[PDB]
Design an enzyme around this catalytic site. Structure first.
Site, PDB file in Angstrom:
ATOM      1  CG  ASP A  76      -1.839   1.187   0.932  1.00 10.07           C
ATOM      2  OD1 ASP A  76      -1.312   2.132   1.959  1.00 10.07           O
ATOM      3  OD2 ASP A  76      -2.566   0.880   0.759  1.00 10.07           O
ATOM      4  CB  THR A  78      -1.565   5.650   2.022  1.00  6.15           C
ATOM      5  OG1 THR A  78      -2.713   5.490   1.543  1.00  6.15           O
ATOM      6  CG2 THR A  78      -1.621   6.202   3.341  1.00  6.15           C
ATOM      7  CD  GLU A  84      10.833   4.662   3.737  1.00  7.65           C
ATOM      8  OE1 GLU A  84      12.324   4.980   3.562  1.00  7.65           O
ATOM      9  OE2 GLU A  84      10.711   3.350   3.694  1.00  7.65           O
TER      10      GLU A  84
HETATM   11 CA   LIG Z   1      -3.889   3.186   1.148  1.00  8.90          CA
HETATM   12 ZN   LIG Z   2      11.842   2.796   7.384  1.00 10.27          ZN
END
Ligand SMILES: [Ca+2]
Ligand SMILES: [Zn+2]
EC number: 3.4.24.77
Length: 132
Positions: A76, A78, A84
């Site tokens: 996914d 998102t 990150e």
């Molecule tokens: Ca998503």
């Molecule tokens: Zn990471």
């Protein structure tokens, strides 16, 4: 509350997912907020890297995030992007954690789609930004 400014313009394929990830963090934490704009503290880029997406960051607002095409299709996007961005906010990788941890990243696998940080992750970001 401190504002950290990001530049999404070099990741044209990921505009919606960057907006989504910024809104998820803004909705989750009190002491830092993310806003798009100029003279940015950190920036997003895109391309191919078989290692996946990654962050080059001091962990306190600065640096850049690379979004990999394969990872963001297999997982996914998102969750990947919010994950990150969590490193730029100061949180470490914890790959052995469950899906309810955003910072376990890809550890739980592509069936995990949760993009929200848990209560402990939220608390830690609030404490890291308590004094700017
Ligand atoms: Ca998503
Ligand atoms: Zn990471």
């Amino acid at each position: 509350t401190v504002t950290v400014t990001y530049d999404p313009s070099n990741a044209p394929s990921f505009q919606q997912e960057i907006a989504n990830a910024a809104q998820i963090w803004n909705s989750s934490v009190r002491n830092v907020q993310l806003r798009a704009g100029g003279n940015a503290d950190f920036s997003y880029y895109e391309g191919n890297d078989s290692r996946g997406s990654y962050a080059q960051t001091d962990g306190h607002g600065r640096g850049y995030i690379f979004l990999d095409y394969q990872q963001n299709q297999q997982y996914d996007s998102t969750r990947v992007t919010a994950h990150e961005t969590g490193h730029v906010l100061g949180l470490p990788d914890h790959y052995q954690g469950p899906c309810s941890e955003l910072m376990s990243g890809g550890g739980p696998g592509p069936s995990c789609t949760n993009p929200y940080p848990n209560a402990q992750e939220r608390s830690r970001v609030n404490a890291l930004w308590a004094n700017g």
